[PDB]
Amino acid sequence: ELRDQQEQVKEDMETKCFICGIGNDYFDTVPHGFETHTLQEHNLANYLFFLMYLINKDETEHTGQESYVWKMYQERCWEFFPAGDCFRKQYEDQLN
Amino acid sequence: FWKKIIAYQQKLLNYFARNFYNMRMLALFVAFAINFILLFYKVSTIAVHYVLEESSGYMEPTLRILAILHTVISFFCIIGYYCLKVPLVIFKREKEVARKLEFDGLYITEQPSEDDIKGQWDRLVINTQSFPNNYWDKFVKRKVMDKYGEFYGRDRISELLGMDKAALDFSDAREKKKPKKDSSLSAVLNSIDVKYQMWKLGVVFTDNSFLYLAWYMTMSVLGHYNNFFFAAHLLDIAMGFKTLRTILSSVTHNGKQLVLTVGLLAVVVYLYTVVAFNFFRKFYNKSEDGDTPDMKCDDMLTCYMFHMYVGVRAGGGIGDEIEDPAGDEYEIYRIIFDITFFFFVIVILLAIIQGLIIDAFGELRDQQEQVKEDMETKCFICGIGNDYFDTVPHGFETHTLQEHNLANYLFFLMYLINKDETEHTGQESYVWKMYQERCWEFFPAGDCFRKQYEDQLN
Amino acid sequence: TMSVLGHYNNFFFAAHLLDIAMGFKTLRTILSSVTHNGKQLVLTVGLLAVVVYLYTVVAFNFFRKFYNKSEDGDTPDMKCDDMLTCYMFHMYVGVRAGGGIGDEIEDPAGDEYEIYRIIFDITFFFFVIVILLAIIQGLIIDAFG
Amino acid sequence: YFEISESSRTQWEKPQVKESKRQFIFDVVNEGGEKEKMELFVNFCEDTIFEMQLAAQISESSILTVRSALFALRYNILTLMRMLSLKSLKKQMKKVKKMTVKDMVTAFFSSYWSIFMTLLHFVASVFRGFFRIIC
Numbered sequence: 001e002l003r004d005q006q007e008q009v010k011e012d013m014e015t016k017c018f019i020c021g022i023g024n025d026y027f028d029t030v031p032h033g034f035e036t037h038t039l040q041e042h043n044l045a046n047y048l049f050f051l052m053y054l055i056n057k058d059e060t061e062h063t064g065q066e067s068y069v070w071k072m073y074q075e076r077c078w079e080f081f082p083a084g085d086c087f088r089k090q091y092e093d094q095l096n
Numbered sequence: 097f098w099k100k101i102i103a104y105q106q107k108l109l110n111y112f113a114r115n116f117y118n119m120r121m122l123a124l125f126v127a128f129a130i131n132f133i134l135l136f137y138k139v140s141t142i143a144v145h146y147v148l149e150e151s152s153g154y155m156e157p158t159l160r161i162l163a164i165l166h167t168v169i170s171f172f173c174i175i176g177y178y179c180l181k182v183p184l185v186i187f188k189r190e191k192e193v194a195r196k197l198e199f200d201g202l203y204i205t206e207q208p209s210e211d212d213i214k215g216q217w218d219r220l221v222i223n224t225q226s227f228p229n230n231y232w233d234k235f236v237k238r239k240v241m242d243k244y245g246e247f248y249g250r251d252r253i254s255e256l257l258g259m260d261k262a263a264l265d266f267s268d269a270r271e272k273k274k275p276k277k278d279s280s281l282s283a284v285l286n287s288i289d290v291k292y293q294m295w296k297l298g299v300v301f302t303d304n305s306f307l308y309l310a311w312y313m314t315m316s317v318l319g320h321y322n323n324f325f326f327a328a329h330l331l332d333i334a335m336g337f338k339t340l341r342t343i344l345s346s347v348t349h350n351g352k353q354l355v356l357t358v359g360l361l362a363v364v365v366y367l368y369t370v371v372a373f374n375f376f377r378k379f380y381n382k383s384e385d386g387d388t389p390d391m392k393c394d395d396m397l398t399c400y401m402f403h404m405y406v407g408v409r410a411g412g413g414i415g416d417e418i419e420d421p422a423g424d425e426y427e428i429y430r431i432i433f434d435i436t437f438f439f440f441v442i443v444i445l446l447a448i449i450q451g452l453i454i455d456a457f458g459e460l461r462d463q464q465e466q467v468k469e470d471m472e473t474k475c476f477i478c479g480i481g482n483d484y485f486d487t488v489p490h491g492f493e494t495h496t497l498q499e500h501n502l503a504n505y506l507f508f509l510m511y512l513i514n515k516d517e518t519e520h521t522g523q524e525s526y527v528w529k530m531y532q533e534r535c536w537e538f539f540p541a542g543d544c545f546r547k548q549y550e551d552q553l554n
Numbered sequence: 555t556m557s558v559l560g561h562y563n564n565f566f567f568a569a570h571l572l573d574i575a576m577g578f579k580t581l582r583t584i585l586s587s588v589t590h591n592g593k594q595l596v597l598t599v600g601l602l603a604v605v606v607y608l609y610t611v612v613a614f615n616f617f618r619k620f621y622n623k624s625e626d627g628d629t630p631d632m633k634c635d636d637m638l639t640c641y642m643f644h645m646y647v648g649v650r651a652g653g654g655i656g657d658e659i660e661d662p663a664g665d666e667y668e669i670y671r672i673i674f675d676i677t678f679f680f681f682v683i684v685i686l687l688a689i690i691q692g693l694i695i696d697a698f699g
Numbered sequence: 700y701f702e703i704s705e706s707s708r709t710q711w712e713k714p715q716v717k718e719s720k721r722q723f724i725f726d727v728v729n730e731g732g733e734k735e736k737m738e739l740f741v742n743f744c745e746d747t748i749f750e751m752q753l754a755a756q757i758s759e760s761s762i763l764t765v766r767s768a769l770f771a772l773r774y775n776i777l778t779l780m781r782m783l784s785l786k787s788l789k790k791q792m793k794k795v796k797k798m799t800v801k802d803m804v805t806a807f808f809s810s811y812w813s814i815f816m817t818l819l820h821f822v823a824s825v826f827r828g829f830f831r832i833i834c
């Protein structure tokens with residue numbers, strides 16, 4: 001059971017993105033697309049750093065996006081997290 | 097003369113390199129023959145004499161001849177190894193050190209960690225004039241020249257890499273040249289690059305397989321002084337037979353966890369020994385003689401030896417071997433002690449070892465199945481699934497055997513290396529430059545000819 | 555042929571009980587756990603025989619005084635004075651013994667080679683009794699899986 | 700787009716935080732649901748941020764064996780190659796003019812025998828050096 005759980009964790013982590021949940025194939029239509037997406041666009045470390053930066057920043061200097069995310073985090077609503085969508089998927093035809 | 101001796105040397109080299117594996121098989125067969133002969137071995141009447149009993153009387157000469165043959169074949173196996181497998185090791189080491197020098201600056205911008213034997217030893221080969229002796233890229237020194245000359249100093253990089261400025265300018269300008277004929281001993285001795293040979297010998301000495309073959313030869317030599325040293329050669333079956341490797345992998349796969357399980361068992365047994373030595377000592381008499389008690393738990397070390405030897409080896413546990421506790425004040429405590437010992441040590445831990453072996457079997461089987469499934473469902477190079485190609489009948493197999501064959505890529509790399517630079521086509525020059533710079537964008541990733549020409553083709 | 559021989563000796567009819575494997579298909583799934591990895595199972599026995607032979611060589615070279623198997627002081631039943639006899643002793647009673655060869659050979663307490671013999675017995679128990687039998691069991695279980 | 704500080708990067712790359720991240724990912728993937736996935740991720744982020752801030756706050760305020768092995772290699776190989784360095788090979792070469800194929804095969808075998816002898820000497824030297832070091 002422990003071995004199978006570790007293997008399942010690795011398989012999920014390597015096949016689907018943690019945040020949006022989109023499969024690796026869609027990003028892999030572009031070379032190294034999934035790795036680029038999971039290391040630049042939807043990095044959980046980047047989200048943690050953003051939360052730290054938003055907490056340490058003062059409220060008066062918040063940008064519009066920062067104020068939106070701050071209010072939504074204070075109210076504990078997590079709709080700002082991309083679920084099933086990404087920048088490339090929104091701008092499919094514009095980008096290509 | 098010299099051309100004859102070198103030619104015959106090369107013939108001997110080729111013969112041994114060709115027949116390396118056959119002699120390795122023959123050594124195992126001769127070892128099995130010798131150890132079968134040693135099974136009929138009788139000790140005789142003080143000084144003890146070991147004599148080979150033989151009604152036929154011909155097994156002693158047969159054993160002597162077999163021992164001599166095994167000793168000869170063992171030496172021939174070292175010669176064959178040196179002729180055949182050493183060049184691959186040298187090629188790999190030279191390629192690794194060259195690529196670390198060029199794309200990492202291992203001896204220019206960083207330094208070895210002073211605890212890496214390989215990194216510290218590879219300092220010698222840099223200054224030698226015979227660098228890529230086996231590796232193809234003979235311009236690695238010039239590449240390092242161009243990459244780090246302006247930064248770390250052209251003069252310092254030249255000194256580090258052993259490229260002399262004098263020879264290049266001497267050849268470029270007008271020079272006086274005097275030929276030297278190979279018949280001269282002085283010439284053939286001067287031709288030798290002593291530093292490169294030193295580094296090569298160091299690499300060979302530090303190679304693992306060469307050390308194993310040297311151990312084999314040492315065992316064979318010792319077998320003449322004592323014939324039972326030939327039994328150590330039966331440990332070569334693991335390497336001899338590949339079907340034995342899958343069985344041994346069930347143990348070697350989880351070897352670290354297997355050793356740590358023994359460590360944990362030794363700690364648990366030590367705790368039980370501490371408890372017994374503090375409380376239950378009257379029950380550890382092991383002598384029927386009433387006058388002389390053989391007290392097995394009066395000492396911490398002796399009691400620990402008792403518990404680890406007979407407590408562990410006993411089927412029921414320590415209570416199978418210590419005194420019965422019936423009609424005693426500590427009866428219930430001792431019974432709990434014995435039951436817990438049996439449960440934790442005999443049952444659980446041995447089950448942990450067995451489960452480790454079984455899980456190793458399952459893991460190997462699952463890994464093989466996963467490899468097969470990936471190989472049959474997606475292409476190795478582009479990574480596109482089989483369904484897209486299978487929209488055309490036999491499309492995936494046609495794609496993986498004609499369009500994106502990894503064997504075809506290997507053959508292309510070989511052809512591009514063996515071809516000269518001047519005759520390269522445009523595509524060949526592109527791929528050659530990109531391979532020299534180690535950029536792998538030319539490999540199709542996520543795309544193919546059919547996918548690019550979807551609508552044009554159909 | 556077995557049926558015909560059964561008339562001359564009625565106990566030859568017992569060989570026909572080996573036909574149940576083919577008779578019942580539900581027996582086939584049980585027997586497959588053994589036949590699936592039969593080659594590896596046989597090679598495991600070969601490896602066990604080699605390991606036991608190495609242990610027998612070590613014992614025959616060093617630990618021979620401990621292989622007396624007779625209570626009669628006048629007549630010692632020396633089980634490891636011969637290479638073949640000692641190998642038979644180790645493969646028969648050493649393997650079949652639950653604890654190992656030390657369960658059946660003399661106690662080494664108060665001897666110069668006490669520590670060496672103890673290591674010998676412990677390693678025998680660990681490698682032969684524990685690991686190899688576990689390899690066989692794991693082969694059967696992996697066949698099931 | 701925002702700012703990431705080097706102190707934050709270092710505290711994130713500390714191995715303790717990496718182990719915590721691996722455990723969190725394991726827990727979420729195995730015994731976690733999609734409804735609470737983001738909530739658990741934010742809780743983990745808050746805990747990690749606090750512990751990295753505390754770590755930054757508190758923070759702000761073999762070789763002998765390798766050397767012996769290389770020395771043994773260098774010495775033994777120099778002893779082996781002193782054979783060639785002596786330049787006294789002339790008296791052998793006087794009969795090299797007059798070798799047979801038998802003799803040249805014998806020399807071929809003797810070269811590898813000498814190499815194996817040098818390996819034995821090197822191994823013995825390494826064992827002696829390791830014994831001296833541990834002593």
Ligand SMILES: Nc1ncnc2c1ncn2[C@@H]1O[C@H](COP(=O)(O)OP(=O)(O)OP(=O)(O)O)[C@@H](O)[C@H]1O
Binds near residue numbers: 013016017019044717
């Ligand atoms: N949102 C995500 N953020 C980061 N990695 C993601 C994400 N979604 C999927 N991944 C995948 O998870 C993997 C990263 O694994 P992880 O963060 O546990 O560490 P690692 O890269 O294996 O190494 P390290 O132990 O040095 O942290 C990559 O294969 C990456 O593609």
Ligand SMILES: Nc1ncnc2c1ncn2[C@@H]1O[C@H](COP(=O)(O)OP(=O)(O)OP(=O)(O)O)[C@@H](O)[C@H]1O
Binds near residue numbers: 475501
């Ligand atoms: N790039 C690729 N090159 C070759 N085979 C590929 C590639 N991608 C996927 N495959 C698949 O791998 C399999 C080929 O397996 P492999 O090359 O290991 O040997 P094989 O065909 O099983 O036989 P053999 O043992 O005779 O080499 C085929 O099913 C093929 O479709």
Ligand SMILES: [Ca+2]
Binds near residue numbers: 060061062
């Ligand atoms: Ca403002």
Ligand SMILES: [Ca+2]
Binds near residue numbers: 518519520
């Ligand atoms: Ca041209």
Ligand SMILES: [Zn+2]
Binds near residue numbers: 037
């Ligand atoms: Zn994503």
Ligand SMILES: [Zn+2]
Binds near residue numbers: 544
């Ligand atoms: Zn392909």
